[PDB]
Amino acid sequence: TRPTLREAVARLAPGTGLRDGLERILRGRTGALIVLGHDENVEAICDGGFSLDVRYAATRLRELCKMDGAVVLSTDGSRIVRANVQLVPDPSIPTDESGTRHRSAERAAIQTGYPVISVSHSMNIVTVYVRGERHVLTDSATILSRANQAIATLERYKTRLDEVSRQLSRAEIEDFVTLRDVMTVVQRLELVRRIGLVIDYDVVELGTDGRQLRLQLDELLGGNDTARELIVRDYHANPEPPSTGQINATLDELDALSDGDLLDFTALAKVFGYPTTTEAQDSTLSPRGYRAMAGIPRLQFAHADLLVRAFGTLQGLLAASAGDLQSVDGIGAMWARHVREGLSQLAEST
Amino acid sequence: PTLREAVARLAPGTGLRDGLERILRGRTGALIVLGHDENVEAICDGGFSLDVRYAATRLRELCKMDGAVVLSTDGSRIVRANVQLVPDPSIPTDESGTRHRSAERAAIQTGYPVISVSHSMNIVTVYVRGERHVLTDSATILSRANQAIATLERYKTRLDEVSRQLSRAEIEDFVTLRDVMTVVQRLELVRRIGLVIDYDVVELGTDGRQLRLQLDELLGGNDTARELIVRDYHANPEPPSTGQINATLDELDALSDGDLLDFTALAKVFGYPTTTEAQDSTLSPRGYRAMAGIPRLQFAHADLLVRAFGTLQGLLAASAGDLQSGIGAMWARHVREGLSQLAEST
Amino acid sequence: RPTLREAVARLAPGTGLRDGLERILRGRTGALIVLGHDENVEAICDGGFSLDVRYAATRLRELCKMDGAVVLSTDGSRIVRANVQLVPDPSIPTDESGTRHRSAERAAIQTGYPVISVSHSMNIVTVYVRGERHVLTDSATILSRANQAIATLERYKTRLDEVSRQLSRAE
Ligand SMILES: Nc1ncnc2c1ncn2[C@@H]1O[C@@H]2COP(=O)(O)O[C@H]3[C@@H](O)[C@H](n4cnc5c(N)ncnc54)O[C@@H]3COP(=O)(O)O[C@H]2[C@H]1O
Ligand SMILES: Nc1ncnc2c1ncn2[C@@H]1O[C@@H]2COP(=O)(O)O[C@H]3[C@@H](O)[C@H](n4cnc5c(N)ncnc54)O[C@@H]3COP(=O)(O)O[C@H]2[C@H]1O
Numbered sequence A: 001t002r003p004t005l006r007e008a009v010a011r012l013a014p015g016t017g018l019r020d021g022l023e024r025i026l027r028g029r030t031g032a033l034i035v036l037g038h039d040e041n042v043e044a045i046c047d048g049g050f051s052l053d054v055r056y057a058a059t060r061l062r063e064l065c066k067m068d069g070a071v072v073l074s075t076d077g078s079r080i081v082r083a084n085v086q087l088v089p090d091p092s093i094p095t096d097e098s099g100t101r102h103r104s105a106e107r108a109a110i111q112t113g114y115p116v117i118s119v120s121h122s123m124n125i126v127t128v129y130v131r132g133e134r135h136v137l138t139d140s141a142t143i144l145s146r147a148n149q150a151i152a153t154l155e156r157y158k159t160r161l162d163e164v165s166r167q168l169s170r171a172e173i174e175d176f177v178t179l180r181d182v183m184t185v186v187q188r189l190e191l192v193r194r195i196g197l198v199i200d201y202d203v204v205e206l207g208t209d210g211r212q213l214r215l216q217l218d219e220l221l222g223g224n225d226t227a228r229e230l231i232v233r234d235y236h237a238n239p240e241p242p243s244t245g246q247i248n249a250t251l252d253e254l255d256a257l258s259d260g261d262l263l264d265f266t267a268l269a270k271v272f273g274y275p276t277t278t279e280a281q282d283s284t285l286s287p288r289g290y291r292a293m294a295g296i297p298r299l300q301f302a303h304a305d306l307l308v309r310a311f312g313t314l315q316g317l318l319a320a321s322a323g324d325l326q327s328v329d330g331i332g333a334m335w336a337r338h339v340r341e342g343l344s345q346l347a348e349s350t
Numbered sequence B: 001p002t003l004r005e006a007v008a009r010l011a012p013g014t015g016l017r018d019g020l021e022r023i024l025r026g027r028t029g030a031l032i033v034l035g036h037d038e039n040v041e042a043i044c045d046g047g048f049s050l051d052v053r054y055a056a057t058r059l060r061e062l063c064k065m066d067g068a069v070v071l072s073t074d075g076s077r078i079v080r081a082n083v084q085l086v087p088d089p090s091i092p093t094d095e096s097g098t099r100h101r102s103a104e105r106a107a108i109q110t111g112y113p114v115i116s117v118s119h120s121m122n123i124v125t126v127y128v129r130g131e132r133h134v135l136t137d138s139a140t141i142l143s144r145a146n147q148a149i150a151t152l153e154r155y156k157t158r159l160d161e162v163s164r165q166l167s168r169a170e171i172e173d174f175v176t177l178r179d180v181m182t183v184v185q186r187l188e189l190v191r192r193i194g195l196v197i198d199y200d201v202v203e204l205g206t207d208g209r210q211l212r213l214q215l216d217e218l219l220g221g222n223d224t225a226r227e228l229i230v231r232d233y234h235a236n237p238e239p240p241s242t243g244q245i246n247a248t249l250d251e252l253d254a255l256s257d258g259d260l261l262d263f264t265a266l267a268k269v270f271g272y273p274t275t276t277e278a279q280d281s282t283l284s285p286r287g288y289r290a291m292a293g294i295p296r297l298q299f300a301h302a303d304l305l306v307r308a309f310g311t312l313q314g315l316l317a318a319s320a321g322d323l324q325s326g327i328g329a330m331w332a333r334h335v336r337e338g339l340s341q342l343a344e345s346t
Numbered sequence C: 001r002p003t004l005r006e007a008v009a010r011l012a013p014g015t016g017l018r019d020g021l022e023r024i025l026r027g028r029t030g031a032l033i034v035l036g037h038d039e040n041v042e043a044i045c046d047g048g049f050s051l052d053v054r055y056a057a058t059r060l061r062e063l064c065k066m067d068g069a070v071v072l073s074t075d076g077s078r079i080v081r082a083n084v085q086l087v088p089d090p091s092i093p094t095d096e097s098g099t100r101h102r103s104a105e106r107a108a109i110q111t112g113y114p115v116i117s118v119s120h121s122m123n124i125v126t127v128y129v130r131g132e133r134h135v136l137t138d139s140a141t142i143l144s145r146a147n148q149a150i151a152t153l154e155r156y157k158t159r160l161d162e163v164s165r166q167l168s169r170a171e
């Protein structure tokens, strides 16, 4: 049940007691070497030092780290057990680290199974070792600059997504949609998602410092998963409306594609089920109407799903009379007038 | 004084903050008492007695000497310097270090604020009645507040879209509970993000006045909108009193950020069922919002008409003479034209 | 209650304590040490850390890198506490300067035990014993003083030989 690397980095994320202590250590320029566990195996490699039983605090961690040596914490992290200790792990344990402190850190994490942090006195750099794996913490200021650059590109990817999405809707009304038109929106939908994943990683590392960025990212992305779901159900090559499993499977195959493959429209076609040939890109497609219904304001997907499965195509849905929509079981009178008005208003703009 | 009130006294643009920034560049550290009275003199040891006007330069130089500087309550004078604070050790504190424990303990006993600039951490911390706030560089606060202003602009764009949808549905007489809870949710988010940006602006002092201008435009009109949405769609059949409206708005503020998401929780506050079927149910607005949109309409006049006709769909349908039936006919002609113009624009 | 002159002997070169203080001086850390532990001293001590370790010169330096004061047992064979904040009664009067040194003398007066204070800014060791104050002097300076006296003793020895020879002849 030893902790994983990703689990350990969370323990050092902003807003935690450990991270508060490490920030004090960094401002003190003392350097440090911390062991996040204590048992018989850890004590076997711990030399001399001091044996103390004190409650953990960020200030207490800094003061004990003013002394040369290593501080050891209990497994639960609630107590500081030892300070000034000399770690003496088995030298046979391999490590490609530099310096006595950092090489001792990796060897110690490997032998005991617990994480070990090493703050460089000369470089003010925090590094955590867990089972031969290494992750370097980054100051929240640098991460925020990375995420704000990505937010700028995400805003532009949303602007281009909106322009090509509007173009596809206009083509759906005129019934001259091509596969190239759909795969143009598919590419932009995925690019928005991928930049979103980049920013999400930056948000997690920011801990409490990323709460403000969490709001900005969730609003800009918001509705992207709905859009990717709607384009798949509207334009999947399989004639019958896709099952809930089939939609998720197609979206997963899209995520599996490389960044270089997203630029290839033919690769995007394979995921939907169309041929990879250049002639297929020019081919006409007939939308089912899922996207058009979603455009209608205040229309829940449950209502639109019955109508799209019933009428089959966006052109039986458009030509429908308000009474025809009502016949479908589960569609109320009032909703039939609202949908018939919605499709008519879509025809006026385009 | 409250903690946040004290932060304004240490905020950029004030004399104290100028002095504290001087102290930070010197790496001297400091320990300052923001008050002087008979009780404070009892805990001040030795030191020097001086009567000079406060200045940023005077505060830095006096803080080069080990010990503490004491200022008068109004901050216009420096009373003593180099003092060794000796507060009662019985006073408990969860601080670490001799300087900082003396700061928190001293603030508690005297009742005045006590600032402590750490030499080892180059960090300013102010204590007020057992409370702790660490000053933050204006650059970090500005980045937080500008992301929040961007998010607030985006929240206003969504607020306008869902707000237009509700009014247009009011004309069409097909309002659902979900339509109302969408506007209620979006209104609260503008409120809460606005309060966050407000605190950052206060801490920013003179650097945040420009953000205050941007913030005051984005918020403006939010309090009126929350009041009117409660009047039109409160579950109690009788039009809610001002006391009931304010109680509903307070209960909204009491909800957590997670509850503002859940539409069913918002329904509970208004008095509707928490079930999903209730969210789909049709609701009929009272018409207070529509009448308020009509120019030159008194709230008392619109309140009489709303109590009589009940809904926005009896106000529209009512003939001009029906509105006068007791109300001034001249106003009745103005109400029918105003209601018709709203239907044409939507 | 050892006397002040007795305390200086405990801090004289060649002792364990003096080895630790010389480490502290080379480190420029400063320190505040209490050479005794009883129930009354603990009454004046705050949080800090509680350790039961044998004294060593190296061990004393590292604990004195942390802010606060370290407390030793009466005989000095064990170290009881580190990072402690002694808070003696401010009523005890002293015209000392700085929070550490005035706190040092007040602590020695109240407890009756010696308390050493090494100044970070001046690299000066001062010991307080029952309201008395003595500043230690580096062995280099004392040796220069004592060699001046040895020169005067040799010249006084020659002068003694001349007057003694003069007296014997007169006898
Ligand atoms: N076996 C060895 N082989 C080669 N060189 C050796 C060595 N042992 C020590 N040194 C050298 O001595 C420097 C200072 O050692 P010190 O223990 O004073 O200062 C140490 C000690 O406070 C701590 N540290 C390093 N390894 C440690 C360990 N295994 N356990 C506890 N603390 C450790 O990190 C400090 C800085 O280490 P850094 O490597 O930068 O600097 C080291 C390194 O250059
Ligand atoms: N009663 C006591 N018990 C244990 N250790 C004691 C002590 N009094 C002083 N020290 C130790 O001496 C250090 C230096 O004190 P100094 O007087 O040079 O310089 C002091 C002094 O100018 C100021 N300071 C702390 N407490 C104060 C107080 N109550 N009144 C005025 N100034 C205070 O903060 C400076 C740095 O304090 P810091 O804690 O960083 O570091 C302290 C602490 O390690």
Ligand SMILES: [Br-]
Pocket (backbone or CB within 6 Å): A099, A101, A120, A121, A122, A123
């Ligand atoms: Br290093």
Ligand SMILES: [Br-]
Pocket (backbone or CB within 6 Å): B029, B097, B099, B117, B118, B119, B120, B121
């Ligand atoms: Br400090």
Ligand SMILES: [Br-]
Pocket (backbone or CB within 6 Å): C030, C098, C100, C119, C120, C121, C122
């Ligand atoms: Br000093």
